Design a protein around this ligand. Structure first.
Ligand code: HEM
Ligand SMILES: O=N[O-]
Length: 152
């Protein structure tokens, strides 16, 4: 957990994201914000987005989607050896942004949804298993840092 085979699947799936990082990033955030409107309130810069149409037309939302998925991609390519990459994000998200770990669960689920939505029939059962494991590992390691900091 994860096996070499599983990491290979994760990084193969990630190639899909890398072909259109901004599009995937945008759809992940829109899925997050529409499914869980409380998450929007954590972003002073997105609180004005009162409709999905406005979300889709927001170039800054797309920009942030790129920032988020680029960060995640860098972490995934470490294949679990990600302490240095993950540390600042756990600290900024717990201490500055005040993001409950529950919201990281939400965004993880959103990634899985968007992969199926954008690649229906091309995100196989093995691939979903591997990507889910990778996102759980990410969450688990963030959670350990949150506990250190006494957040939530
Ligand atoms: C895959 C999980 C996530 C990744 C990789 C990620 C990554 C990032 C990065 C790289 C930044 C800019 C640098 C920083 O402040 O640390 C950032 C900022 C931020 N993130 Fe996340 N994030 C994730 C999940 C979330 C979630 C679920 C929320 C809220 C529901 C959130 C809220 C924020 C906020 C409010 C900012 C500051 C925005 C600004 O001031 O421009 N993040 N995130
Ligand atoms: O959109 N997560 O920073």
């Amino acid at each position: 957990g994860l096996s070499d085979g599983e990491w290979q699947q994760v990084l193969n799936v990630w190639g899909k994201v890398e072909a259109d990082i901004a599009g995937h990033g945008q759809e992940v955030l829109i899925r997050l914000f529409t499914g869980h409107p409380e998450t929007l309130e954590k972003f002073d810069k997105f609180k004005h987005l009162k409709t999905e149409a406005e979300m889709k037309a927001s170039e800054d939302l797309k920009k942030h989607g790129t920032v988020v998925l680029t960060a995640l991609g860098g972490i995934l390519k470490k294949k679990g050896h990600h302490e240095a990459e993950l540390k600042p994000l756990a600290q900024s998200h717990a201490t500055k942004h005040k993001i409950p770990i529950k919201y990281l669960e939400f965004i993880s689920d959103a990634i899985i949804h968007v992969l199926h939505s954008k690649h229906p029939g091309d995100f196989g059962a093995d691939a979903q298993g591997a990507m889910t494991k990778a996102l759980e590992l990410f969450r688990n390691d963030i959670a350990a840092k949150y506990k250190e900091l006494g957040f939530q």
